[PDB]
Amino acid sequence: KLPPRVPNLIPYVGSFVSFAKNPVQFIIDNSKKYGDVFTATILGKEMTFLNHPKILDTFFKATDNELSLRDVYRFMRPVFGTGVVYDADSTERMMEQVKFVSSGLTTARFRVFVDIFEDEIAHKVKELGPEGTVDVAELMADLIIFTASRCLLGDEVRQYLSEKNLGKLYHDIDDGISPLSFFYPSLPAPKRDKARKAVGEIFQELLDKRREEHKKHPERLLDESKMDVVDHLLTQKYKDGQELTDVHRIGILIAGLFAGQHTSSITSSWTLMNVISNKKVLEKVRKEQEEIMGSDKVLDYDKVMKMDYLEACMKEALRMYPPLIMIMRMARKPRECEQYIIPKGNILVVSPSVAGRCTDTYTNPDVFDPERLTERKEHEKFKYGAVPFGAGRHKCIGENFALLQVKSIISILLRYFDMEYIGKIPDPSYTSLVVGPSPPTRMRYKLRKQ
Numbered sequence: 001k002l003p004p005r006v007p008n009l010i011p012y013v014g015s016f017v018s019f020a021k022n023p024v025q026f027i028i029d030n031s032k033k034y035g036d037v038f039t040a041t042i043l044g045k046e047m048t049f050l051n052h053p054k055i056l057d058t059f060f061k062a063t064d065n066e067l068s069l070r071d072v073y074r075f076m077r078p079v080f081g082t083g084v085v086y087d088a089d090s091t092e093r094m095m096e097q098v099k100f101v102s103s104g105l106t107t108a109r110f111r112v113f114v115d116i117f118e119d120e121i122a123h124k125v126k127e128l129g130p131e132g133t134v135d136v137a138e139l140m141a142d143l144i145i146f147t148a149s150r151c152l153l154g155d156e157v158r159q160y161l162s163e164k165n166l167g168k169l170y171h172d173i174d175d176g177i178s179p180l181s182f183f184y185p186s187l188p189a190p191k192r193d194k195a196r197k198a199v200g201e202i203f204q205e206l207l208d209k210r211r212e213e214h215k216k217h218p219e220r221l222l223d224e225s226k227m228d229v230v231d232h233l234l235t236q237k238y239k240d241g242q243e244l245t246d247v248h249r250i251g252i253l254i255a256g257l258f259a260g261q262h263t264s265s266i267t268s269s270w271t272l273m274n275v276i277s278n279k280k281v282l283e284k285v286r287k288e289q290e291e292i293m294g295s296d297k298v299l300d301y302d303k304v305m306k307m308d309y310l311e312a313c314m315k316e317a318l319r320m321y322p323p324l325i326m327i328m329r330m331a332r333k334p335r336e337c338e339q340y341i342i343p344k345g346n347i348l349v350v351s352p353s354v355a356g357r358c359t360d361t362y363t364n365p366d367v368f369d370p371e372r373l374t375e376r377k378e379h380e381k382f383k384y385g386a387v388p389f390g391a392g393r394h395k396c397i398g399e400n401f402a403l404l405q406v407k408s409i410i411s412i413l414l415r416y417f418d419m420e421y422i423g424k425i426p427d428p429s430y431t432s433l434v435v436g437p438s439p440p441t442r443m444r445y446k447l448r449k450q
């Protein structure tokens with residue numbers, strides 16, 4: 001029959017209050033009370049939490065006409081744009097648009113991306129000086145504004161960042177997104193909308209300029225190392241032959257940038273903080289760096305590909321502090337889950353955060369221990385033991401780019417600086433759509449070469 005329910009505090013509002021304090025502890029506590037599968041009413045939505053790795057196969061492999069992503073993420077429409085990704089006309093159109101972004105994330109582009117990271121960090125160290133203190137979360141966000149933008153859109157974007165305040169516009173859009181919008185997609189957000197329109201105008205101009213650059217220098221279209229997402233959007237069509245609109249191209253780029261920034265800056269923050277705060281982990285990370293770097297003075301792709309221990313450190317931060325804490329779908333048909341049937345219209349929920357603290361999978365889950373993955377392989381105990389990037393048909397298409405960006409940034413920063421974190425590693429703050437550490441996140445730095 002139906003899964004057990006979390007008793008409602010009030011009708012309609014349901015369990016919103018305990019939920020919004022800490023959605024992760026809400027799921028944990030209620031798992032303990034009600035088991036692997038339970039339902040809560042939350043601001044009018046029937047939400048059915050799936051809380052053990054064991055049962056997740058049917059969730060991750062269902063077709064979009066059974067478990068719809070578009071029904072639950074459509075709320076992002078005022079950020080991304082009408083007709084884009086989860087507001088696309090169909091599952092099919094969404095998948096095609098996602099492929100246009102994946103199409104600028106090639107090996108050839110990754111070799112160039114390393115150079116971009118080196119270049120932006122070198123600019124940034126001029127601000128930072130020989131020593132100081134800096135907020136970790138801000139530093140990473142600031143770096144990734146410039147790196148993600150240039151990686152996805154090309155170098156032509158940088159003059160807008162440097163001269164037309166584009167980075168402030170991003171913040172205006174992105175602080176304009178409340179997680180509450182998931183329940184109330186029509187919440188007014190006029191500052192967000194003003195900024196989104198401004199970025200729209202700038203990106204329209206970037207498209208217009210690229211078009212005539214394609215005329216002046218069509219060889220660009222033949223060089224895989226110089227082809228970016230803007231180039232692919234300007235020269236591709238849907239499979240059925242329908243051309244894209246410039247409004248669709250703008251929205252895809254904004255969606256791509258949004259994806260390319262927040263989850264990465266947050267992950268590089270939690271990763272760096274935990275690395276520099278743990279003497280044994282820092283030793284190993286630096287020993288690995290010194291071996292891979294050898295006599296060379298700058299990074300390249302092949303070097304990053306060898307940073308296995310640093311990668312493990314990132315995965316361990318992803319276990320502990322996954323930035324997307326809830327993966328959702330709407331049930332378009334009733335769904336069997338173990339002994340239960342989950343009603344049509346219910347929203348099924350999987351939490352990477354809950355999974356990462358599951359003590360059936362992880363021993364001492366509150367401890368940052370990259371060796372739990374590299375030596376003890378604790379993630380491998382279940383097919384869905386670790387799902388920070390999703391799984392199945394909708395698994396993150398950005399995973400390798402995020403790995404590259406975060407490993408590269410943390411590698412280059414280490415090369416430049418000794419760094420120590422000030423204070424206790426914070427708790428996550430659940431006030432934002434993409435979850436990051438509670439501010440402030442400060443560290444001291446000092447340059448390693450006079």
Ligand SMILES: CC[C@@H]([C@H](C)O)n1ncn(-c2ccc(N3CCN(c4ccc(OC[C@@H]5CO[C@@](Cn6cncn6)(c6ccc(F)cc6F)C5)cc4)CC3)cc2)c1=O
Nearest residue numbers: 020023073085179180182255256258259263326430431433
């Ligand atoms: C602050 C007021 C406060 C008051 C005081 O209570 N409050 N306090 C607490 N709560 C509260 C807390 C939690 C919630 N829930 C938490 C879960 N939320 C949620 C839903 C969907 C999300 O999906 C984002 C999609 C998936 O993938 C992305 C991202 N991405 C993928 N890779 C890289 N980036 C993506 C994909 C493709 C693209 F191309 C682009 C993209 F971006 C976008 C993320 C999060 C909603 C419900 C609700 C309310 C409050 O309301």
Ligand code: HEM
Nearest residue numbers: 259260263264267327328388389390394395396397398402
């Ligand atoms: C550490 C960084 C990141 C994490 C933790 C992350 C996590 C996720 C997760 C969980 C999903 C699955 C959402 C769902 O099934 O409901 C996802 C989907 C996606 N991510 Fe990421 N992501 C990261 C970086 C990126 C980057 C860099 C990009 C692009 C440049 C990107 C683009 C996407 C896209 C386009 C999807 C949609 C796939 C689909 O619906 O078919 N992500 N990511």
Ligand SMILES: [Ca+2]
Nearest residue numbers: 009015017018
């Ligand atoms: Ca409650």
Ligand SMILES: [Ca+2]
Nearest residue numbers: 050051350351
């Ligand atoms: Ca779960």
